[PDB]
C-alpha cells in the first residue's frame, strides 16, 4: 500500500505533529525538523532531523526565514534520506516565523522532486502578531505554492471565529489540526479498503498532482438527510482560505452500511457539485462497511480552483 509521511517544519509543524501522534494515526510515518533543538529533543516523531546547527548553534531561526532556507538547504541529504520511498508526503508548517517560513517550502521541493505526491498545509499568523509576520508569511505560502503539488492554508484569525471568551488556546490548536488529520485518514481509508465502487491512490493522484489550491474534509451524520447533511459537513470551512467555490475536480468516497441508497448518493454528489458552482469533474467512490447501522461518512478532496472558469 502506498507510503504516506507527515513532516512538521518548525515550531507549529512540530506541534502539529506531536498531537497528531497523540491523536492516534495508524499507517503514517512522521518525521520532525527543526533548527531548535530543544523543541526537537521534546518530538514524539521516530524520524527527527535537526537542520542549520552551525547557523542557529541548535537554536531556532529568531523569525528569520533566510536562516531556515539555507539549514533546510544545507541539510538537503538527510532531508532526501528520510523521504526516500515516500509515494505521498504532507508538510505542516506555521508561515511567518523563521523555520517553518523558509524551510517548509525546501522540504516540499524536495519530497515532489522525489516522485512523491505532496500536499502542504501550513497556517497563515494571526493579525495581532502584525503586519512583518504576516508579510512574511505571505511569501512563505508563494514559495509554498510553487514547491507542492496541492497546498491547504489555515488563516488563524479564522480561530477568532470559532471560539468563546474562554476557550483554551490548546483547544483552539486542535481544531486546525484536524483539517490535515482528517485528510490523511482518509486518504489512509480510502487506500486500505476495496469499496463497491473502488477509488485509490491513482484517484487521489488525480486529483491532486499539479494543482494549486485544495479542500480536503470529511462529514459524518446519521439519520434523516443523513447524506445532504454529511456532505454540507464535508465542504464546511470555517477555517479554510480555500472554500469549495471554484472547485472543478473532486474525489467524493460515500462509506455506509447496508442501507446506502442511490437516492442519497446523488443527493450528496448534487450538494458538492451545487457548492461548488462549477462543471465539476466528480471521482466518486462507495464502500459499504456492513458493521455500519445508519451512518454515513463523506470525505471529499477538491481541486482546480485555478483553472479557468468555466462558461
Ligand atoms: N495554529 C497554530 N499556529 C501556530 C502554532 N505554533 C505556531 N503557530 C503559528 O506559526 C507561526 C510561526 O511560528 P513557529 O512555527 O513557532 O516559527 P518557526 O519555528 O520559526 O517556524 C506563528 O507566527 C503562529 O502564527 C500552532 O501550534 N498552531
Not at 119 to 124: D, L, N, P, Y
Not at 230 to 237: G, L, P, Q, V, Y
Not at 282 to 298: K, S
Request: aromatic fraction near 2%.
Amino acid at each position: 500500500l502506498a507510503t504516506l509521511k507527515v513532516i512538521g517544519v518548525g515550531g507549529g509543524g512540530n506541534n502539529a505533529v506531536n498531537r497528531m501522534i497523540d491523536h492516534g494515526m495508524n499507517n503514517v510515518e512522521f518525521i520532525a525538523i527543526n533548527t531548535d533543538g530543544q523543541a526537537l529533543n521534546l518530538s514524539k516523531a521516530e524520524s527527527k532531523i535537526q537542520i542549520g546547527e552551525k547557523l542557529t548553534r541548535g537554536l531556532g531561526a529568531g523569525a528569520n526565514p533566510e536562516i531556515g532556507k539555507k539549514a533546510a538547504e544545507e541539510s538537503r541529504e538527510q532531508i532526501e534520506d528520510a523521504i526516500q520511498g515516500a509515494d505521498m508526503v504532507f508538510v505542516t508548517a506555521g508561515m511567518g516565523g523563521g523555520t517553518g517560513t523558509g524551510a517548509a517550502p525546501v522540504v516540499a521541493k524536495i519530497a515532489k522532486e522525489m516522485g512523491a505526491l505532496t500536499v502542504g498545509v501550513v497556517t497563515r499568523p494571526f493579525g495581532f502578531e502584525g503586519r512583518k509576520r504576516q508579510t512574511q508569511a505571505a511569501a512563505g505560502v508563494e514559495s509554498m505554492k510553487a514547491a507542492v503539488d496541492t497546498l491547504i492554508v489555515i488563516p488563524n484569525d479564522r480561530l477568532l471565529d470559532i471560539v468563546d471568551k474562554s476557550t483554551p488556546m490548546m483547544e483552539a490548536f486542535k481544531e486546525a489540526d484536524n483539517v490535515l488529520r482528517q485528510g490523511v485518514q482518509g486518504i489512509s481509508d480510502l487506500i486500505a479498503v476495496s469499496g463497491e465502487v473502488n477509488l485509490d491512490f491513482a484517484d487521489v493522484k488525480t486529483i491532486m498532482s499539479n494543482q494549486g489550491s485544495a479542500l480536503m474534509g470529511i462529514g459524518v451524520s446519521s439519520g434523516e438527510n443523513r447524506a445532504v447533511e454529511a456532505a454540507k459537513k464535508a465542504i464546511s470551512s470555517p477555517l479554510l482560505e480555500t472554500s469549495i467555490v471554484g472547485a472543478q475536480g473532486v474525489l467524493m468516497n460515500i462509506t455506509g452500511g447496508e442501507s446506502l441508497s442511490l437516492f442519497e448518493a446523488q443527493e450528496a454528489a448534487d450538494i458538492v457539485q451545487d457548492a461548488a458552482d462549477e462543471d465539476v469533474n466528480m471521482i466518486f467512490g462507495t464502500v459499504i462497511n456492513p458493521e455500519l447501522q445508519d451512518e454515513i461518512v463523506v470525505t471529499v478532496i477538491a481541486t482546480g480552483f485555478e483553472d479557468k472558469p468555466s462558461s
